[PDB]
Design a protein around this ligand. Sequence first.
Ligand code: A1H92
Ligand code: A1H92
Ligand code: ZN
Ligand code: ZN
Lengths: 261, 260
Amino acid sequence: KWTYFGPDGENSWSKKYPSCGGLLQSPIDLHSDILQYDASLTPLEFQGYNLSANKQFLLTNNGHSVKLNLPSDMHIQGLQSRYSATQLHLHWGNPNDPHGSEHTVSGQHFAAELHIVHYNSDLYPDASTASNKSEGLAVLAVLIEMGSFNPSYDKIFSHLQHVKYKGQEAFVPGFNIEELLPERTAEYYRYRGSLTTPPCNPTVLWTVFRNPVQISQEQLLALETALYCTHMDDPSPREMINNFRQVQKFDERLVYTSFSQ
Amino acid sequence: WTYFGPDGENSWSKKYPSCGGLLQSPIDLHSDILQYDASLTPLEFQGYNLSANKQFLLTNNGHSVKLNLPSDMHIQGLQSRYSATQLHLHWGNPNDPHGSEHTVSGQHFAAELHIVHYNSDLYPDASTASNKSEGLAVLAVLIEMGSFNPSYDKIFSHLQHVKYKGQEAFVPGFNIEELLPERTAEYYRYRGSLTTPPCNPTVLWTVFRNPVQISQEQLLALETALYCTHMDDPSPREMINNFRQVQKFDERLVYTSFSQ
Ligand SMILES: CCOc1c(F)c(S(N)(=O)=O)c(F)c(NC2CCCCCCC2)c1S(=O)(=O)CCCO
Ligand SMILES: CCOc1c(F)c(S(N)(=O)=O)c(F)c(NC2CCCCCCC2)c1S(=O)(=O)CCCO
Ligand SMILES: [Zn+2]
Ligand SMILES: [Zn+2]
């Protein structure tokens, strides 16, 4: 029954989900005082991201975001373990305030944020098992700015009107997921953190790319207006907007960067 | 409650329900939510020139350093008289010296001074006012690093004597208006809450537009002088990062006394 607004909003998550009040919480504000170059943060390699256009992948409204299920033959290499994809999802604001990224950079929110969730498939048989374990998850984050129309993100957004309500599912033809990534993926921030939603487990290695991507105002408006947190028959409908957590205290962490300037 | 660890701000709402309710402060002050309001005329600070023949109690309460203020000190200009009760500060730490509560265009200032007042027309004391309608008014001064500030040193010169939780010192009266910035006629105004437990949504906030300056050495003293633990605690903890994160603030405006 957790939400991002009202009595069950983010200041209340810890009442039911103790880790939301614990250490290592995400998201965070990426600002100069807490950044440190780390020359060991070499490029990631994206393996299996080119999904076949003749296959299809399940898109679901889970009542909190829209998520696309991804095949476990999709993985990121370059980490000390291989991590296999499990799903991607987004966070966004609202039509009157299109400023709903989770991470901020030097105190500024971006329009929206894409997260590609992966689990340690060297160590664990599935993402749920990995999720409460040491080194379990790795999330890639792409900051999204209002800008030009993005045909690659539209491969997801063109299906919004078919997953309007909680529990609804649709199929999306495969496409190359690396088209959702920005320029210069070798430039990223890296830190230890958590899931940004309940249960807030502190088991996520975050990689936030330095450069944002653009999607148009019209794409953001569709994202911000198409979806409901509630089921199709709910007498108290709730729009799915502003589904981002506020930034969290650092608690002595640093954020390591693969770029020195 | 604490500002860190398991009893930190995401857990306040367990014991202090209002911390998860409406009208929470602090917030980011940014151009999209600002609206000029011609009704926001200058405040008058009466009784702020405190007798130098009087002393005023400075305490480390384990959360901040607070100075008790007399009720004959009051703001004029609001519908009711609001009488002073105390002032205190929020700050960051030497590795990240950006610990204001309010942000401006997403940016923290170095520190923030708050002068708390209560509606003495309606209520007999601040504690009684704190959970009631129109109960509280806080004045907020944003602090940045710059020139040595003699006025802030009238407080900061006493910090050594309030190093540990529970410790107190007497401060001789001085003109509190000296702690306020230039052009106090320019301010942001909104209805919000206490930024600490119990987080009651009973605060009329006035955040002055213009910051004050203090020296690099004054800010480092604030950030390093105090612990949040008792003297005899075998596990001492420095008092740093004593600010709440900004809160969501949707479908609302912050009113400004300035348009330019
Ligand atoms: C609003 C989106 O919700 C997130 C979420 F924000 C994050 S994040 N931002 O990457 O921390 C998520 F990782 C997930 N998905 C998970 C997939 C791994 C499966 C284990 C349990 C939950 C995490 C999900 S979610 O699966 O969409 C909902 C999980 C509720 O526990
Ligand atoms: C870290 C400083 O704590 C604040 C504080 F942050 C605020 S603020 N930022 O102005 O909201 C406060 F107002 C207070 N003091 C108030 C005095 C009025 C008396 C009744 C309740 C406490 C609030 C205090 S406090 O009195 O120092 C601690 C209150 C714990 O209930
Ligand atoms: Zn996410
Ligand atoms: Zn305060």
